[PDB]
Short mmCIF file of C-alpha atoms in Angstrom, two decimals:
data_model
loop_
_atom_site.label_atom_id
_atom_site.label_comp_id
_atom_site.label_asym_id
_atom_site.label_seq_id
_atom_site.Cartn_x
_atom_site.Cartn_y
_atom_site.Cartn_z
CA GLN A 14 304.21 -18.91 248.07
CA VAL A 15 302.77 -16.15 245.86
CA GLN A 16 299.65 -14.03 246.24
CA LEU A 17 297.63 -11.65 244.07
CA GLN A 18 296.05 -8.51 245.53
CA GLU A 19 293.88 -6.02 243.64
CA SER A 20 293.58 -2.27 244.14
CA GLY A 21 291.77 0.68 242.59
CA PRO A 22 288.45 2.32 243.44
CA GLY A 23 285.36 0.18 243.83
CA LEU A 24 283.19 2.72 242.00
CA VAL A 25 283.13 4.05 238.45
CA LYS A 26 280.75 6.42 236.71
CA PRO A 27 279.00 5.52 233.43
CA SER A 28 280.89 6.33 230.22
CA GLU A 29 284.17 6.70 232.11
CA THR A 30 287.56 4.97 232.44
CA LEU A 31 288.08 2.10 234.88
CA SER A 32 291.44 1.69 236.63
CA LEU A 33 291.99 -1.58 238.51
CA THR A 34 295.53 -2.72 239.34
CA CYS A 35 296.46 -6.15 240.71
CA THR A 36 299.78 -6.33 242.58
CA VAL A 37 302.00 -9.36 243.17
CA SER A 38 303.76 -10.36 246.40
CA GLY A 39 306.06 -13.32 246.88
CA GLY A 40 306.97 -13.70 243.21
CA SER A 41 308.23 -12.03 240.05
CA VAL A 42 306.19 -10.90 237.05
CA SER A 43 308.82 -11.57 234.38
CA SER A 44 310.33 -14.77 235.80
CA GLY A 45 308.90 -18.25 235.33
CA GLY A 46 307.17 -17.75 231.98
CA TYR A 47 303.58 -17.64 233.25
CA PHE A 48 300.59 -15.55 232.14
CA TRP A 49 298.25 -13.04 233.80
CA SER A 50 294.52 -12.79 233.12
CA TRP A 51 291.56 -10.73 234.32
CA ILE A 52 288.26 -12.53 234.94
CA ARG A 53 285.04 -10.83 236.08
CA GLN A 54 281.84 -12.30 237.50
CA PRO A 55 278.49 -10.49 237.79
CA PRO A 56 276.48 -11.18 240.97
CA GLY A 57 274.33 -14.24 240.34
CA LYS A 58 275.90 -14.85 236.92
CA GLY A 59 278.70 -17.01 235.56
CA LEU A 60 282.35 -16.11 235.20
CA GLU A 61 283.31 -14.02 232.16
CA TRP A 62 286.79 -13.96 230.64
CA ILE A 63 288.07 -10.47 229.84
CA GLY A 64 291.62 -10.89 228.58
CA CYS A 65 295.06 -12.31 229.22
CA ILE A 66 298.54 -10.77 229.20
CA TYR A 67 302.16 -11.94 229.23
CA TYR A 68 305.11 -10.08 230.72
CA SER A 69 305.83 -8.94 227.16
CA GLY A 70 303.36 -7.04 224.97
CA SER A 71 301.32 -10.11 223.99
CA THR A 72 297.59 -9.51 224.53
CA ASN A 73 294.36 -11.31 223.64
CA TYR A 74 290.87 -10.01 224.42
CA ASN A 75 287.36 -11.43 224.35
CA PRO A 76 285.49 -10.73 221.07
CA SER A 77 282.55 -9.23 222.97
CA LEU A 78 285.00 -7.08 224.97
CA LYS A 79 287.31 -6.21 222.06
CA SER A 80 288.48 -2.63 221.39
CA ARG A 81 287.71 -1.70 225.02
CA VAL A 82 290.24 -3.62 227.17
CA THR A 83 293.64 -1.99 227.75
CA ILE A 84 295.97 -3.96 230.03
CA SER A 85 299.62 -3.07 230.68
CA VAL A 86 302.44 -4.64 232.70
CA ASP A 87 305.00 -2.60 234.67
CA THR A 88 307.76 -4.95 235.83
CA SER A 89 309.42 -2.21 237.91
CA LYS A 90 306.50 -2.15 240.37
CA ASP A 91 305.87 -5.92 239.94
CA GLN A 92 302.20 -5.41 239.05
CA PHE A 93 299.85 -5.18 236.08
CA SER A 94 296.80 -2.96 235.56
CA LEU A 95 293.68 -3.15 233.39
CA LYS A 96 291.99 -0.10 231.86
CA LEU A 97 288.39 -0.26 230.64
CA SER A 98 286.64 2.26 228.39
CA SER A 99 282.92 3.05 227.98
CA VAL A 100 281.74 1.36 231.17
CA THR A 101 277.95 1.02 231.40
CA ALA A 102 275.53 -0.08 234.11
CA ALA A 103 275.77 -3.69 232.86
CA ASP A 104 279.50 -3.79 233.75
CA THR A 105 278.77 -4.32 237.47
CA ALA A 106 280.82 -7.44 238.19
CA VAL A 107 283.26 -8.76 240.77
CA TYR A 108 286.74 -8.46 239.26
CA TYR A 109 289.14 -11.34 239.95
CA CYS A 110 292.89 -11.19 239.28
CA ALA A 111 293.87 -14.85 238.82
CA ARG A 112 297.32 -16.26 238.07
CA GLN A 113 297.34 -18.59 235.05
CA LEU A 114 300.03 -21.28 234.85
CA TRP A 115 299.01 -22.86 231.52
CA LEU A 116 297.61 -20.62 228.78
CA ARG A 117 295.05 -23.29 227.81
CA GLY A 118 294.72 -24.54 231.39
CA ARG A 119 293.78 -23.81 234.98
CA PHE A 120 293.87 -20.53 236.86
CA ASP A 121 295.65 -22.05 239.84
CA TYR A 122 295.72 -18.97 242.11
CA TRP A 123 292.77 -16.57 242.33
CA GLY A 124 292.92 -13.17 243.97
CA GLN A 125 290.08 -11.93 246.14
CA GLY A 126 287.35 -10.24 244.13
CA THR A 127 286.87 -6.49 244.43
CA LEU A 128 283.31 -5.21 244.05
CA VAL A 129 282.70 -2.76 241.19
CA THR A 130 279.43 -0.81 241.10
CA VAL A 131 278.42 1.52 238.25
CA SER A 132 275.75 4.08 239.13
CA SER A 133 274.75 7.52 237.82
CA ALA A 134 274.64 10.06 240.67
CA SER A 135 276.87 12.14 242.93
CA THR A 136 278.15 10.60 246.16
CA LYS A 137 275.72 11.89 248.79
CA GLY A 138 275.31 11.32 252.50
CA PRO A 139 272.44 9.37 254.02
CA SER A 140 269.32 10.80 255.65
CA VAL A 141 268.61 9.04 258.95
CA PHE A 142 265.09 9.28 260.34
CA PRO A 143 263.81 7.92 263.67
CA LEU A 144 261.27 5.08 263.65
CA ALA A 145 258.98 5.69 266.62
CA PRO A 146 257.26 2.64 268.14
CA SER A 147 253.63 2.96 269.21
CA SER A 148 250.57 0.88 270.10
CA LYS A 149 250.23 -0.30 266.48
CA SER A 150 253.95 -1.24 266.44
CA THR A 151 253.64 -4.02 269.05
CA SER A 152 252.07 -7.47 268.60
CA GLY A 153 251.88 -9.21 271.97
CA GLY A 154 254.41 -8.83 274.77
CA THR A 155 257.15 -7.47 272.49
CA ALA A 156 257.52 -4.30 270.42
CA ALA A 157 259.77 -3.16 267.59
CA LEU A 158 261.82 -0.04 266.85
CA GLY A 159 264.36 0.90 264.24
CA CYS A 160 266.03 3.54 262.11
CA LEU A 161 265.49 4.45 258.45
CA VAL A 162 268.38 5.03 256.04
CA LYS A 163 267.21 6.71 252.84
CA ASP A 164 268.75 8.48 249.83
CA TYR A 165 272.43 7.57 250.04
CA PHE A 166 275.14 6.66 247.52
CA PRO A 167 277.07 4.27 247.66
CA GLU A 168 276.87 0.92 249.39
CA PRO A 169 277.61 -0.20 252.07
CA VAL A 170 276.23 1.43 255.23
CA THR A 171 276.59 -0.10 258.69
CA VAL A 172 274.07 0.38 261.50
CA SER A 173 274.89 -0.40 265.13
CA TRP A 174 272.58 -0.16 268.15
CA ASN A 175 273.95 1.38 271.38
CA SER A 176 277.50 1.32 269.94
CA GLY A 177 277.21 -2.42 269.30
CA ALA A 178 275.96 -3.30 272.79
CA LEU A 179 272.60 -4.50 271.39
CA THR A 180 272.89 -7.39 268.93
CA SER A 181 270.03 -9.74 269.82
CA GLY A 182 266.98 -9.14 267.65
CA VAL A 183 268.80 -6.66 265.40
CA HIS A 184 267.91 -7.17 261.73
CA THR A 185 269.86 -5.23 259.10
CA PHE A 186 268.16 -5.49 255.72
CA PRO A 187 269.91 -5.42 252.33
CA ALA A 188 269.65 -2.22 250.33
CA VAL A 189 267.23 -1.76 247.44
CA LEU A 190 267.52 0.63 244.51
CA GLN A 191 265.05 3.50 244.72
CA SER A 192 263.08 4.92 241.80
CA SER A 193 265.78 7.63 241.38
CA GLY A 194 269.34 6.35 241.61
CA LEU A 195 269.93 6.15 245.35
CA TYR A 196 269.48 3.26 247.79
CA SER A 197 267.37 2.75 250.92
CA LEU A 198 267.30 0.33 253.85
CA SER A 199 266.52 0.11 257.56
CA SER A 200 267.79 -1.63 260.69
CA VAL A 201 265.32 -2.66 263.40
CA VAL A 202 265.48 -4.45 266.75
CA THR A 203 262.75 -6.32 268.63
CA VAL A 204 262.35 -5.31 272.28
CA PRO A 205 259.85 -6.02 275.05
CA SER A 206 257.38 -3.16 275.45
CA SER A 207 258.08 -2.77 279.19
CA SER A 208 261.41 -1.00 278.54
CA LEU A 209 260.05 1.40 275.90
CA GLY A 210 259.82 4.40 278.23
CA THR A 211 262.73 3.48 280.52
CA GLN A 212 265.56 2.55 278.12
CA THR A 213 267.24 4.78 275.53
CA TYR A 214 267.85 3.30 272.08
CA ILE A 215 270.25 5.11 269.73
CA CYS A 216 271.11 3.91 266.23
CA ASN A 217 274.56 4.62 264.76
CA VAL A 218 274.51 4.84 260.95
CA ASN A 219 277.92 5.22 259.30
CA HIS A 220 278.59 6.02 255.63
CA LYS A 221 282.35 5.76 255.04
CA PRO A 222 282.56 6.96 251.38
CA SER A 223 280.71 10.18 252.26
CA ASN A 224 282.43 10.36 255.69
CA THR A 225 279.18 10.87 257.62
CA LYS A 226 278.40 9.41 261.05
CA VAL A 227 274.87 10.03 262.33
CA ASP A 228 273.53 9.01 265.75
CA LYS A 229 269.73 9.14 265.99
CA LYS A 230 267.82 8.48 269.21
CA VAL A 231 264.63 6.41 269.01
CA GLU A 232 261.71 7.41 271.24
CA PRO A 233 258.03 6.40 271.37
CA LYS A 234 255.70 8.45 269.19
CA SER A 235 254.13 11.54 270.78
CA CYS A 236 250.68 12.42 269.47
CA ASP A 237 250.40 16.02 268.26
CA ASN B 256 280.82 -18.61 218.59
CA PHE B 257 281.72 -21.53 220.86
CA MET B 258 279.81 -21.63 224.15
CA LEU B 259 279.73 -24.22 226.93
CA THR B 260 276.25 -25.36 227.98
CA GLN B 261 275.78 -26.23 231.66
CA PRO B 262 272.76 -27.22 233.76
CA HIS B 263 271.66 -24.11 235.64
CA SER B 264 270.16 -25.93 238.65
CA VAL B 265 271.24 -29.35 239.93
CA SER B 266 270.12 -30.78 243.28
CA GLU B 267 270.88 -34.07 245.02
CA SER B 268 270.60 -35.45 248.54
CA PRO B 269 273.87 -36.02 250.45
CA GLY B 270 275.65 -39.33 250.05
CA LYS B 271 274.51 -40.08 246.49
CA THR B 272 276.13 -39.70 243.05
CA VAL B 273 275.34 -36.83 240.67
CA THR B 274 276.72 -36.00 237.22
CA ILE B 275 277.30 -32.43 235.99
CA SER B 276 277.50 -31.95 232.23
CA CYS B 277 279.24 -29.33 230.08
CA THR B 278 278.28 -29.41 226.40
CA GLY B 279 280.13 -27.53 223.67
CA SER B 280 278.12 -26.15 220.76
CA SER B 281 280.51 -25.79 217.80
CA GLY B 282 283.94 -27.03 218.85
CA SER B 283 284.47 -30.59 220.00
CA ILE B 284 284.84 -31.13 223.74
CA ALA B 285 288.07 -33.14 223.38
CA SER B 286 289.70 -30.35 221.34
CA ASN B 287 290.88 -28.26 224.30
CA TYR B 288 291.44 -28.81 228.00
CA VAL B 289 288.43 -28.44 230.31
CA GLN B 290 288.81 -26.94 233.80
CA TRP B 291 286.13 -27.15 236.49
CA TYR B 292 285.98 -24.44 239.16
CA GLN B 293 284.06 -24.70 242.44
CA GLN B 294 283.35 -21.23 243.85
CA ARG B 295 281.86 -20.54 247.27
CA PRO B 296 279.44 -17.60 247.57
CA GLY B 297 281.40 -14.49 248.51
CA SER B 298 284.73 -16.20 247.79
CA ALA B 299 287.26 -16.64 245.02
CA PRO B 300 286.83 -19.63 242.68
CA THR B 301 289.14 -22.59 243.22
CA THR B 302 290.32 -25.18 240.71
CA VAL B 303 288.98 -28.64 241.60
CA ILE B 304 290.02 -30.53 238.44
CA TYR B 305 292.43 -30.09 235.54
CA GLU B 306 293.34 -31.96 232.32
CA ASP B 307 289.73 -33.33 232.40
CA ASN B 308 290.70 -36.33 234.56
CA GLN B 309 293.43 -35.17 237.00
CA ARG B 310 292.62 -33.99 240.54
CA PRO B 311 294.87 -31.26 241.99
CA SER B 312 296.55 -31.84 245.34
CA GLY B 313 294.12 -30.89 248.10
CA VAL B 314 290.74 -31.74 246.59
CA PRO B 315 289.09 -35.08 247.49
CA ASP B 316 289.18 -38.08 245.18
CA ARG B 317 285.40 -37.82 244.59
CA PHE B 318 285.87 -34.94 242.10
CA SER B 319 286.13 -37.27 239.10
CA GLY B 320 285.76 -35.98 235.55
CA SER B 321 284.97 -37.86 232.34
CA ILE B 322 284.83 -36.80 228.70
CA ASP B 323 282.07 -37.91 226.33
CA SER B 324 283.55 -36.60 223.10
CA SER B 325 280.93 -38.20 220.84
CA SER B 326 278.19 -36.00 222.32
CA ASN B 327 280.61 -33.03 222.69
CA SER B 328 279.84 -32.98 226.43
CA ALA B 329 282.25 -32.73 229.36
CA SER B 330 281.12 -34.57 232.50
CA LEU B 331 282.07 -34.07 236.15
CA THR B 332 281.03 -36.88 238.50
CA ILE B 333 280.47 -36.14 242.20
CA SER B 334 280.16 -39.01 244.69
CA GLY B 335 279.25 -38.69 248.35
CA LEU B 336 277.63 -35.26 248.50
CA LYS B 337 278.33 -33.26 251.66
CA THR B 338 277.39 -29.90 253.17
CA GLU B 339 280.47 -28.00 251.94
CA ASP B 340 279.84 -29.12 248.34
CA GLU B 341 277.12 -26.47 247.92
CA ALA B 342 278.91 -24.13 245.53
CA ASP B 343 278.84 -22.83 241.97
CA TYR B 344 280.44 -25.08 239.34
CA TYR B 345 281.85 -23.63 236.11
CA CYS B 346 283.54 -25.45 233.23
CA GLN B 347 286.30 -23.74 231.25
CA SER B 348 287.58 -23.96 227.68
CA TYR B 349 290.02 -22.13 225.42
CA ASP B 350 288.60 -22.36 221.87
CA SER B 351 291.16 -20.40 219.83
CA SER B 352 292.91 -17.65 221.84
CA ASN B 353 289.62 -16.82 223.60
CA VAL B 354 288.91 -18.47 226.96
CA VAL B 355 285.23 -19.41 227.28
CA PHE B 356 283.61 -20.36 230.60
CA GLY B 357 280.49 -22.38 231.34
CA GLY B 358 276.96 -21.40 232.26
CA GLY B 359 277.21 -22.48 235.88
CA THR B 360 275.96 -25.48 237.81
CA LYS B 361 274.96 -25.00 241.43
CA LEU B 362 275.28 -27.93 243.81
CA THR B 363 272.23 -28.35 246.02
CA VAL B 364 272.35 -30.43 249.19
CA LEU B 365 268.62 -31.07 248.80
CA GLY B 366 265.66 -25.84 256.71
CA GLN B 367 263.16 -24.47 259.22
CA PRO B 368 259.44 -25.02 258.58
CA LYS B 369 256.76 -22.40 257.96
CA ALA B 370 257.24 -19.39 260.23
CA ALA B 371 254.74 -16.73 261.29
CA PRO B 372 255.32 -13.42 259.49
CA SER B 373 255.40 -10.90 262.35
CA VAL B 374 254.58 -7.48 260.86
CA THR B 375 255.37 -3.98 262.17
CA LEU B 376 254.31 -0.62 260.72
CA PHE B 377 256.08 2.70 261.34
CA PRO B 378 254.68 6.16 260.52
CA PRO B 379 256.90 8.95 259.13
CA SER B 380 258.88 10.91 261.69
CA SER B 381 258.51 14.62 262.42
CA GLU B 382 262.17 15.23 261.54
CA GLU B 383 261.56 13.74 258.09
CA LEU B 384 258.43 15.89 257.72
CA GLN B 385 260.50 19.00 258.48
CA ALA B 386 262.82 17.86 255.66
CA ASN B 387 259.84 17.95 253.23
CA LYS B 388 259.86 14.14 252.98
CA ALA B 389 257.74 11.24 254.20
CA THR B 390 258.27 7.48 254.23
CA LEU B 391 256.10 4.57 255.35
CA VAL B 392 258.17 1.55 256.42
CA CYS B 393 256.66 -1.94 256.66
CA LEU B 394 258.76 -4.64 258.34
CA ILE B 395 258.48 -8.37 257.63
CA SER B 396 260.33 -10.80 259.86
CA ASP B 397 260.62 -14.30 261.33
CA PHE B 398 258.75 -15.98 258.48
CA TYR B 399 259.09 -19.04 256.25
CA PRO B 400 258.87 -19.67 253.28
CA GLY B 401 260.83 -16.68 251.99
CA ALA B 402 258.10 -15.52 249.60
CA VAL B 403 255.97 -12.62 250.87
CA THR B 404 253.85 -10.27 248.75
CA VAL B 405 253.25 -6.73 250.02
CA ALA B 406 250.52 -4.26 249.05
CA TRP B 407 250.27 -0.75 250.48
CA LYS B 408 246.86 0.83 251.06
CA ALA B 409 245.71 4.45 251.29
CA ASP B 410 242.60 3.93 253.46
CA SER B 411 241.08 1.64 250.81
CA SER B 412 242.95 2.42 247.56
CA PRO B 413 246.08 0.34 246.82
CA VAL B 414 249.35 2.26 246.53
CA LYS B 415 252.00 1.42 243.93
CA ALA B 416 253.87 4.67 243.26
CA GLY B 417 256.97 5.07 245.41
CA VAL B 418 256.73 1.50 246.75
CA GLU B 419 260.13 -0.11 247.35
CA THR B 420 260.37 -3.62 248.79
CA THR B 421 263.26 -5.90 249.73
CA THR B 422 263.80 -9.52 248.76
CA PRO B 423 263.57 -11.93 251.73
CA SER B 424 266.86 -12.69 253.48
CA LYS B 425 267.59 -15.53 255.89
CA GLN B 426 267.86 -14.58 259.56
CA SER B 427 270.06 -16.03 262.31
CA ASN B 428 267.19 -18.19 263.65
CA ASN B 429 266.71 -19.97 260.26
CA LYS B 430 263.74 -17.71 259.42
CA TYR B 431 263.54 -14.90 256.84
CA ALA B 432 263.33 -11.10 256.95
CA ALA B 433 262.05 -8.45 254.55
CA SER B 434 260.96 -4.82 254.39
CA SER B 435 258.81 -2.49 252.31
CA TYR B 436 259.22 1.28 251.93
CA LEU B 437 256.59 3.73 250.67
CA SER B 438 258.06 7.06 249.59
CA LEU B 439 255.47 9.80 250.01
CA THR B 440 255.01 13.56 250.13
CA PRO B 441 254.08 15.30 253.41
CA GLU B 442 250.82 16.51 251.85
CA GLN B 443 249.80 13.00 250.74
CA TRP B 444 250.49 11.60 254.22
CA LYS B 445 247.85 13.87 255.78
CA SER B 446 245.47 13.81 252.79
CA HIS B 447 244.28 10.27 253.57
CA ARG B 448 242.77 9.37 256.93
CA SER B 449 244.97 6.30 257.42
CA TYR B 450 247.61 4.18 255.71
CA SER B 451 248.00 0.41 256.02
CA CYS B 452 250.42 -2.31 254.93
CA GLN B 453 249.00 -5.75 254.11
CA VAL B 454 251.23 -8.84 254.13
CA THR B 455 250.12 -12.01 252.34
CA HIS B 456 252.01 -15.14 253.44
CA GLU B 457 250.84 -18.66 252.51
CA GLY B 458 247.28 -17.37 252.08
CA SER B 459 247.02 -15.81 255.54
CA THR B 460 247.00 -12.01 255.66
CA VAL B 461 248.48 -9.90 258.48
CA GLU B 462 247.56 -6.21 258.36
CA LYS B 463 248.72 -3.23 260.41
CA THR B 464 247.52 0.36 260.14
CA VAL B 465 248.89 3.80 260.97
CA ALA B 466 247.29 7.25 261.12
CA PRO B 467 248.65 10.81 261.32
CA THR B 468 248.67 11.59 265.04
#
């Protein structure tokens, strides 16, 4: 059959130019007389139509998105790309490259949606801090310990305990936007309090866009 | 200025029949073809009907669509609701060289019971203090329903500046999980005698406290 795969960076700065290219495998752009269209979808919102293109220069754009959508087709590389101008923070949507058989009809084949996030900061590494359990951190026969990930850009960040050997009781929370640009989250694991002083717990926080891997040991709090 | 109106929330128990509407404002609903798309969360949308009455090869027969052109409303009838039917439904149009989608109708199947909100409090670390930063982290876990209100306290005064909290998220054991973060300066951490995080869940309050030690 045929398939549609998108490329381009998943991040874009405000008031910049977006470059997302969708490539085609198993078919031909010019042959068959079909259309191409770009459709975006914000998280938790409905689908929004951006524009449609033919293998020739025919183009039609949404009236709300007019004078900002620039889409071109290069038949030599068997792909088409969309360029967006004046991207704001409200442009955060999942971009879908869907094949369209009938111009007034269905989008029969949909490509997988790339995530586009618009934020205003410089890509910075995370700051990992230990989360020391204590007497106030245990309720009953079990205790809790974790690791804090604060002031990083962008999503996502993965946290693994003991190089993935500890999975039971591990809770990784979704990130939340801080008061100034960056994100923050934590990953914690519930453990019986008997093995607090006899077992070593190390969290492994990885931030691929900033290329930072931080291993932080977790120990019980020492009163000073 | 043609927009498709869809019911935002639709719920029905499995095995029954539910009708999803799609009303056009200006243009008539029989003017252009209407396409319904069923999209799973975290997945690409898939076409489940086309030509307003024809089912594509692969979808079940139950995805039946009807057109009420007098009321300018497009209808999609679902019979025999199942677990996998829980997805976002969007209706499509074309207008005049400008494809217009629908508002979005979510299929609800129409669940663990109340769960105790275990609470853990963590003081700022010494390594963070050496970095001229401080953070109080409150953890909220193993609870149901997923609606917890947090309120930080500085000994007795409530704290709102620098408070960051997370929306509840479902756990592996059918319960929910949440967190709250209190950004603070190293001087403000030692200025007050103690800091506490109070969790209100279904009226009951679970409180933990921490002190600089």
